[PDB]
């Protein structure tokens, strides 16, 4: 996020980091329950990647994070890689997250819910702060 | 480039798809929602994470960080997967697995 600010630690408890085998953070995701994460299809997650829950500072070793294996990647087969449309994947975890102060689920909308232009929302992540 | 160690956040507005098309044209599909162009931007490494809106006291997943400006310009809208268009598939997938 460019021109954002640091979050209060633990205040976005559904936010996960997707890390590859080398420990590199490459994408975010959101817990929707203890067994499932929603992310983008274009992130290209595999069962060799790891979901990291409960994290704030990726440079700290003192956070009680949960490193969760991925059992199966469910890419929405409406996903169109040419247009990047329908850009959603579900990750089924091999072992459930343990919900806590700092690890819990985001709500999902009904398909008929209205989120009007002009509404102020929030986005979160460990993406670049400067290109 | 700078990658942060610490989790970042930004507030930003939702756009209409019609208005977002003034920036991105026919790249904008119904299963996308644009947000930003407001002095902040999602950027590389944010992909897959949440765009949440607070409704009746609870944060609800409205978007999934998807794509946008290749330089993360804060004057151009970011593009997010529109969760309302995708949630039926989420529920079907959970039910079947």
């Amino acid at each position: 996020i460019v021109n954002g600010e640091e979050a209060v630690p633990g205040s976005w408890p559904w936010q996960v980091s997707l890390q590859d085998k080398t420990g590199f953070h490459f994408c975010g995701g959101s817990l929707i329950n203890e067994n499932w994460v929603v992310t983008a299809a274009h992130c290209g997650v595999t069962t060799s990647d790891v979901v990291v829950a409960g994290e704030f500072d990726q440079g700290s070793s003192s956070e009680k994070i949960q490193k969760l294996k991925i059992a199966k990647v469910f890419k929405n087969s409406k996903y169109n890689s040419l247009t990047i449309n329908n850009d959603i994947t579900l990750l089924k975890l091999s072992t459930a997250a343990s919900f806590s102060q700092t690890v819990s689920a985001v709500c999902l909308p009904s398909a008929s819910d209205d989120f009007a232009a002009g509404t102020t929302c929030v986005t979160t992540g460990w993406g670049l702060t400067r290109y | 480039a700078n990658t942060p160690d610490r989790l970042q956040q930004a507030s930003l507005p939702l756009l209409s798809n019609t208005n977002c098309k003034k920036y991105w044209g026919t790249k904008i599909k119904d299963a996308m929602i644009c947000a930003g162009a407001s002095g902040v931007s999602s950027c590389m490494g944010d992909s897959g994470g949440p765009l949440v809106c607070k409704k009746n006291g609870a944060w609800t997943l409205v978007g999934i960080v998807s794509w946008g400006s290749s330089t993360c310009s804060t004057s151009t809208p970011g593009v997010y997967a529109r969760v309302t268009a995708l949630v039926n598939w989420v529920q079907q997938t959970l039910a079947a697995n």
């Binding site: 983008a40 274009h42 990047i84 993406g127 | 991105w24 790249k27 999602s42 950027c43 590389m44 490494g45 944010d46 992909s47 960080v65 998807s66 794509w67 946008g68 400006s69 290749s70 993360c72 970011g78």
Partner: peptide, 4 residues
């Protein structure tokens, strides 16, 4: 444009 670029994936994010």
């Amino acid at each position: 444009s670029w994936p994010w």
